[PDB]
Amino acid sequence: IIGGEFTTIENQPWFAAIYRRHRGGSVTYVCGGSLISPCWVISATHCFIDYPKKEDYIVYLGRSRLNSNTQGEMKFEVENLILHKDYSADTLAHHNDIALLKIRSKEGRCAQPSRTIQTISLPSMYNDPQFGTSCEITGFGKENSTDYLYPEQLKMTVVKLISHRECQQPHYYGSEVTTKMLCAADPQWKTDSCQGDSGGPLVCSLQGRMTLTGIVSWGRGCALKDKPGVYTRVSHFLPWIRSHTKE
């Protein structure tokens, strides 16, 4: 997250921290994710497409810090890694960038709700906030494009939803952005998500209720003028989510 303010996992109880195991013992941060139910973590396919290997992943819930423990955090293994079969990556755009991680503790349990671990509501069929609505994004992504390391503390910022018409303008993204995607940036281009934030949540208050409206997917640079962050439009993938989460 470029700019924005440092936060805790009490303010973003649905945020999951996904890490990948390595040969030797080194664990590195992969992507963010969201807890949509106690045995499911949504996230983006581009995060795992190169290493489809569920045993290599570790998911943390209730964790505020990158490389250190948080009282009340819970560690989970990945029981099932579901990637979207129609996923593809173009010059900049990532299509059908959505994934599901069935989680389970070493005891075989799923997440246990607490003040630091809570689920986020999914949207209704084709029901998104009006364009111009303020929404929040959270993540352990880069603070600056020139950084090679990620911040140690979780961050968050507020961005505004941008219409498909504006985002489809030539100076923006043109025809690269589709209706299955959502743009969203700061009117001053000062804050935005960045590398490392992928898979994280784009949360919008929809009728008094926190809803998971988008998933951090792609963008040209970070906080660049006329180059909004692009998110996977969650409301357009409800049938896919429901079918893979049943049994």
Report on the structure:
With 247 residues, the chain is mainly beta. Helices cover 5% and strands 36% of the residues. The chain contains 2 helices and 15 strands. The chain has helices at 164-167, 238-245; strands spanning 5-6, 15-21, 27-37, 40-43, 57-61, 74-83, 88-89, 94-95, 99-104, 134-139, 155-162, 181-185, 201-206, 209-218, 229-233. The protein has a 6-stranded antiparallel β-barrel with strand order 10-11-12-15-14-13. A hairpin with a 4-residue loop joins β7 and β8. The longest helix has 8 residues, at 238-245. The termini are far apart. It is classed as hydrolase.
Beta-strand content estimate: 35-45%
Radius of gyration: 17 Å
For CATH, the homologous superfamily of the largest domain is named as: Trypsin-like serine proteases
The neighbouring-strand order within the major sheet is 10-11-12-15-14-13
Distance between the termini: 35 Å
| Principal-axis shape | globular
User: Main β-sheet: number of strands, strand sense, barrel status?
Assistant: 6 strands, antiparallel, barrel
Query: Any idea of the CATH class of the largest domain?
Result: Mainly Beta
The topology string of helices and strands comes to EEEEEEEEEEEHEEEEH
Q: Return the structural class.
A: mainly beta
User: How is the CATH topology of the largest domain named?
Assistant: Thrombin, subunit H
Total count of helical runs of at least 4 residues:
2
What oligomeric state best describes the polypeptide chains here?
A: monomer
What is the number of beta strands?
A: 15
User: Helix fraction?
Assistant: under 10%
Tell me which CATH architecture of the largest domain applies here: Beta Barrel
Domain module tally: 2
PDB class: hydrolase
Keywords: urokinase, inhibitor, serine protease, human, hydrolase
Assembly: monomeric
Entry title: urokinase plasminogen activator B-chain-benzamidine complex
